[PDB]
Every structure is written in C-alpha cells, then in structure tokens.
mmCIF file of C-alpha atoms (C1' of nucleotides) and ligand atoms in Angstrom:
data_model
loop_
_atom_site.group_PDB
_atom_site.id
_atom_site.type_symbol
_atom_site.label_atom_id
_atom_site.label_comp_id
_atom_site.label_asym_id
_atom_site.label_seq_id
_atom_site.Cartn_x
_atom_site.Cartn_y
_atom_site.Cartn_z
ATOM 1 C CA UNK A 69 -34.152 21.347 8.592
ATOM 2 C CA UNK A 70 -37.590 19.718 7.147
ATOM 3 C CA UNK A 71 -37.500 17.566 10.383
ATOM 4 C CA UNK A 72 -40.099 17.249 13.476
ATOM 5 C CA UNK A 73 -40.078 14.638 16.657
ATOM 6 C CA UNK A 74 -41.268 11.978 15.014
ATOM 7 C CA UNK A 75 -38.856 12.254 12.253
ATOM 8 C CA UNK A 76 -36.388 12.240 15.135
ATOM 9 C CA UNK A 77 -37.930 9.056 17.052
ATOM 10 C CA UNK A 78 -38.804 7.350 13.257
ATOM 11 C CA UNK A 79 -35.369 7.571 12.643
ATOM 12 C CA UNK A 80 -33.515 6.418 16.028
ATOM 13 C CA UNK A 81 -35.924 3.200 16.218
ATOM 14 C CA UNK A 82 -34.737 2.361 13.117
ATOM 15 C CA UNK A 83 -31.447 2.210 13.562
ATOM 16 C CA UNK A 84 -30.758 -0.651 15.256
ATOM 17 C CA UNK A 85 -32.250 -2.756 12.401
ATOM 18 C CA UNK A 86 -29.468 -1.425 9.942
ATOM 19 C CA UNK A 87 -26.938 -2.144 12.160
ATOM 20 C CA UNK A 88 -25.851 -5.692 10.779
ATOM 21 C CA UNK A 89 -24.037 -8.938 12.305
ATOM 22 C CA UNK A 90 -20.603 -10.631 10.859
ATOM 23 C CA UNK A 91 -21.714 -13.197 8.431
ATOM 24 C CA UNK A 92 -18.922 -15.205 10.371
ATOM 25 C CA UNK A 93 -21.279 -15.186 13.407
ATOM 26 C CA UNK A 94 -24.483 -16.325 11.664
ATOM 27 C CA UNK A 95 -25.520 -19.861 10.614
ATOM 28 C CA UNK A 96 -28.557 -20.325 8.127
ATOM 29 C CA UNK A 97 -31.164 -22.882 8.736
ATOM 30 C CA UNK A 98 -32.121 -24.867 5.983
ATOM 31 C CA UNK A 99 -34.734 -23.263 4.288
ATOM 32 C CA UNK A 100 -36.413 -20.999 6.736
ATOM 33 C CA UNK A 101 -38.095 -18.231 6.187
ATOM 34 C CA UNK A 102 -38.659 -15.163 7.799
ATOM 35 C CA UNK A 103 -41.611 -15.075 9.127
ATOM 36 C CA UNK A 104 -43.528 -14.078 12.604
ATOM 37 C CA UNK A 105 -41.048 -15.059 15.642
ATOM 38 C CA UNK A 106 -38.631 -17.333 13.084
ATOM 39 C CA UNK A 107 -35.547 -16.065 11.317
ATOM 40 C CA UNK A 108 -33.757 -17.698 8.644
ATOM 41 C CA UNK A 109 -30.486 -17.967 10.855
ATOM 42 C CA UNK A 110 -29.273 -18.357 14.653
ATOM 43 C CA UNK A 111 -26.309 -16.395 16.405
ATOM 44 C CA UNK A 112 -23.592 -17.824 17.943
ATOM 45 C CA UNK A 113 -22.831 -16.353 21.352
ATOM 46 C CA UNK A 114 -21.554 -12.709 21.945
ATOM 47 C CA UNK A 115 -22.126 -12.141 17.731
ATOM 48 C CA UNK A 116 -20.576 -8.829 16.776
ATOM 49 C CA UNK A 117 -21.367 -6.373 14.547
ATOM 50 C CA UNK A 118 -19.602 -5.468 10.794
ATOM 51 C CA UNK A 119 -16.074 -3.739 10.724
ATOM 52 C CA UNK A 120 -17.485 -1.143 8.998
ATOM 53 C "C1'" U B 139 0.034 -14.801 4.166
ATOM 54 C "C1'" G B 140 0.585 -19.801 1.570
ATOM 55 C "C1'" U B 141 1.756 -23.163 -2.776
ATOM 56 C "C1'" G B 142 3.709 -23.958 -8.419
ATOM 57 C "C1'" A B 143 7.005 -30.157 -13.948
ATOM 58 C "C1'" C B 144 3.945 -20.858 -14.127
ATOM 59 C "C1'" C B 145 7.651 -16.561 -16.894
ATOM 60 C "C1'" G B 146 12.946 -14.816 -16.336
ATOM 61 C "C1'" U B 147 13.998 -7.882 -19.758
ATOM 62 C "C1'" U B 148 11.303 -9.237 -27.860
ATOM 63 C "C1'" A B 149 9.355 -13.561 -21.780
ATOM 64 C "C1'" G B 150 5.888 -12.290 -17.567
ATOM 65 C "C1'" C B 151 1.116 -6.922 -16.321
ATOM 66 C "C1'" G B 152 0.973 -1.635 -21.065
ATOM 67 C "C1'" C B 153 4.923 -0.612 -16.896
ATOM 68 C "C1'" A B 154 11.979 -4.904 -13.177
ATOM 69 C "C1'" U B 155 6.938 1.554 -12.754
ATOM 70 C "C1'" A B 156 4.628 4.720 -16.702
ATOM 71 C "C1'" G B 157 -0.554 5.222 -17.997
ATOM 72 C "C1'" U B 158 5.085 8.743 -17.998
ATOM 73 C "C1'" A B 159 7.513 10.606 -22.947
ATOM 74 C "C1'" C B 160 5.117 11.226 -27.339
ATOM 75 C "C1'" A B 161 0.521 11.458 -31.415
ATOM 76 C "C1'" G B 162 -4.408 14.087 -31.363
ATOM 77 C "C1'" U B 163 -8.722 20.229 -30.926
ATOM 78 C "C1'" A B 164 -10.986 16.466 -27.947
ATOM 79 C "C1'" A B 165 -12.856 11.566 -26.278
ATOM 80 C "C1'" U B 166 -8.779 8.319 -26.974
ATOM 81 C "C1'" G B 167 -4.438 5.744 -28.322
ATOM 82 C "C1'" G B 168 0.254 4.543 -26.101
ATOM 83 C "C1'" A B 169 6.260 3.174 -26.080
ATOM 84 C "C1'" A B 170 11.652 2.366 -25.283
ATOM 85 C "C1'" G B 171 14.474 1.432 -20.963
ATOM 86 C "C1'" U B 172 18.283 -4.280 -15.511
ATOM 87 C "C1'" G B 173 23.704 -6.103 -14.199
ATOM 88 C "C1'" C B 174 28.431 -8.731 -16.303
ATOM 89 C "C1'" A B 175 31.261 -11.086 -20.469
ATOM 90 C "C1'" U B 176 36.483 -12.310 -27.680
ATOM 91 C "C1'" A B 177 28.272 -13.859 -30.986
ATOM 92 C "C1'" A B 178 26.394 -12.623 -36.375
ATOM 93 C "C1'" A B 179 25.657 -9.341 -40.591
ATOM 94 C "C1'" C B 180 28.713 -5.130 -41.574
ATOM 95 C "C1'" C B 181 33.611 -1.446 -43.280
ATOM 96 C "C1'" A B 182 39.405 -1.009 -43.640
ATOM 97 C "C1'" A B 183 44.124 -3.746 -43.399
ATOM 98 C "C1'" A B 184 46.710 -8.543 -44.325
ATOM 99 C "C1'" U B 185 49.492 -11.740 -51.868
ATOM 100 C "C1'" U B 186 54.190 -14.340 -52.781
ATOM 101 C "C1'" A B 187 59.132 -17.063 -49.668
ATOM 102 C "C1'" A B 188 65.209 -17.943 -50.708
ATOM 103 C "C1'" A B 189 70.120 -20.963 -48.156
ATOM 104 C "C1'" G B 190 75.102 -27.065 -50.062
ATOM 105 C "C1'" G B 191 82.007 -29.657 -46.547
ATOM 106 C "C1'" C B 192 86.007 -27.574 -39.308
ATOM 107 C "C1'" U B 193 90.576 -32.269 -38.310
ATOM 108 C "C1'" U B 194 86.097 -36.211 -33.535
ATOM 109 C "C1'" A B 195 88.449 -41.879 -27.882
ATOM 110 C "C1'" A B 196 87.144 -40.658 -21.784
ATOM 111 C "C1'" A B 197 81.391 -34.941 -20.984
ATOM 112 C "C1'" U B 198 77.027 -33.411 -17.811
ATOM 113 C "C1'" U B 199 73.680 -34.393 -13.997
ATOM 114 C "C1'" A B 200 71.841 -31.777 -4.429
ATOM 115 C "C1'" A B 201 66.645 -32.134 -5.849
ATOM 116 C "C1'" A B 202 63.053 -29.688 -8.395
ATOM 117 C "C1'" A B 203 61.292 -25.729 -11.678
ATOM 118 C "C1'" A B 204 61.760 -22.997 -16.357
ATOM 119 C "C1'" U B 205 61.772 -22.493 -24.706
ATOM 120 C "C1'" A B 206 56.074 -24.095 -29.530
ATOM 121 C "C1'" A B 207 50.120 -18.624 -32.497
ATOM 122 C "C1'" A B 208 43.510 -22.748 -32.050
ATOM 123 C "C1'" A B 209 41.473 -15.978 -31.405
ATOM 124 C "C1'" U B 210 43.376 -8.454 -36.013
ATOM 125 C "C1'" G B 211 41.148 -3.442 -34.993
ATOM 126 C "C1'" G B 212 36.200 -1.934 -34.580
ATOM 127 C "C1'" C B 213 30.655 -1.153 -34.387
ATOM 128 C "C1'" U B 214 26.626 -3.795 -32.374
ATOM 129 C "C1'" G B 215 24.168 -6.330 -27.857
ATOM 130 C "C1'" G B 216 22.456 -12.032 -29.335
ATOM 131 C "C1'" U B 217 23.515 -16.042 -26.089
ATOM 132 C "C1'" G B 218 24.735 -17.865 -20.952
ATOM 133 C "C1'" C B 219 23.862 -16.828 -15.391
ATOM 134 C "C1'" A B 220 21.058 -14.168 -11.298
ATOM 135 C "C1'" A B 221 16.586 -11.524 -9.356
ATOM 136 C "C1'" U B 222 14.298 -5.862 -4.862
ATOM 137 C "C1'" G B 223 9.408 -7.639 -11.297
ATOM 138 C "C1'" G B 224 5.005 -10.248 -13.023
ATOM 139 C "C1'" C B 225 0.999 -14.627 -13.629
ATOM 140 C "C1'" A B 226 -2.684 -18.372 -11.362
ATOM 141 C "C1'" C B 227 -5.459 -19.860 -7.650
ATOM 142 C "C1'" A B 228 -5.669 -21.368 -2.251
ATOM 143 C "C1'" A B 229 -6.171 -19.959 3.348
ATOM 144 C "C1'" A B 230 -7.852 -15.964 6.597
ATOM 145 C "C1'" A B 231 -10.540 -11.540 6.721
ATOM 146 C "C1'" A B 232 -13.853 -8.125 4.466
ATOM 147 C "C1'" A B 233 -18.366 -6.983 1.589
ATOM 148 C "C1'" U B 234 -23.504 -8.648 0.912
ATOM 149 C "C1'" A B 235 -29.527 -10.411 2.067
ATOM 150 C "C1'" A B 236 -33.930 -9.851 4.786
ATOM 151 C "C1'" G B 237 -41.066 -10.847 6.571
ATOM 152 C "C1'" A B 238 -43.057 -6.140 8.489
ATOM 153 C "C1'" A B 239 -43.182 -0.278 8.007
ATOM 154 C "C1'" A B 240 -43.261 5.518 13.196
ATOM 155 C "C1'" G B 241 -43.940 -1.200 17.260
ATOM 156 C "C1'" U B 242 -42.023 -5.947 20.345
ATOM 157 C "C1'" U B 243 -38.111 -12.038 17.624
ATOM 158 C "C1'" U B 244 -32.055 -14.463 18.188
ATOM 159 C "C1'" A B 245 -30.605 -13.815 25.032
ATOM 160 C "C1'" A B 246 -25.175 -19.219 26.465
ATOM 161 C "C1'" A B 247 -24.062 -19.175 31.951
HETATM 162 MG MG1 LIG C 191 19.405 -10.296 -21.935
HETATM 163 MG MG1 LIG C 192 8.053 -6.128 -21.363
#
RNA sequence: UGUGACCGUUAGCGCAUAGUACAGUAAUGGAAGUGCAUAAACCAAAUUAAAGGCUUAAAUUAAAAAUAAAAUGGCUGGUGCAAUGGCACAAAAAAUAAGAAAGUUUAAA
C-alpha cells in the first residue's frame, strides 16, 4: 500500500536485471572486468534464462 | 543415469524403513527385527553279554535287479547360499556472482 508511480516504474525497470542467464550459456573471459560497455562474459546464441 | 580386487542382516546408513517402540518434565537420546537347512554350550535317557557231534559221489544258473547303524529326543539360530537394502565418487542437469543505482552494454543470420 506505501507505493506511488515511481515505485511502480523503479520496480518494473529493474526487473529485467534480476532475471539471470544459464551458467551453461555463458563463457567468462579471462580476467575481465565489468566495467563501462565490457562484461566479464559473452553469450552464446539464443541464451536462456534459469529453470527457476 | 553410469562404474567398483566397496558391504551382504552383530556387515553396509541409526533404519533390507524407524527417527518408529521405548527412556526423559523438557531440549535430547535411541533399539530389536529377511528367506531356507541334523552347529556349540546346555538338561533327561542309554552299564554289563551267554551257546560244543545228522550217516555226504552226479546240484543251480533267459538276462538283469534285489540282505550290513558313520548321525537319540530337545532348546537355540551360528555357519553356508541369494538379494526389491546400503557406501564412494563419476556423467548430465540444477543452484550461484556482478561495475552502476529511478537510465542505455551481450544482438548469430
Ligand atoms: Mg544370517
Ligand atoms: Mg544393521
């Protein structure tokens, strides 16, 4: 009940971001870091998302 | 699911299901128990041994088979054999991490 439209849109945007890939569909570079643009990993094609 | 110079009912998980019966006010602790068959301890029964004189010369056999005490009655559940139970890891899958903070990245045709 102690929610307003931004709590709404805060919460939607952030969704997607918890929402993770199978660690069978990710391969980690070697000692990258996140940082702006560069991810630690790439996906292999059509990657889906965690069973549960 | 896969493999074993891992176990085979005092073994292997506490459990061949049971965290049950039971102990405790409580937290808690925690068993026994598969199927078949002359094993041991153990209790009753079981002592001994005698025998002294028919007159003997022409049978039998398809074939085969058929005369001899290693062990009393019990109670108990070891040993031997088997597995609808356990132990260890392996393969596959699953789980898992973020830099930022109401803002943009990672998309194979
Ligand atoms: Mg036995
Ligand atoms: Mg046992």
């Amino acid at each position: 009940d102690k929610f307003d439209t931004i709590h709404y849109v805060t919460a939607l945007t952030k969704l997607p971001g918890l929402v993770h890939y199978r660690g069978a569909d990710l391969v980690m570079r070697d000692g990258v870091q996140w940082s702006e643009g560069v991810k630690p990993f790439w996906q292999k094609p059509n990657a889906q998302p965690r069973k549960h």
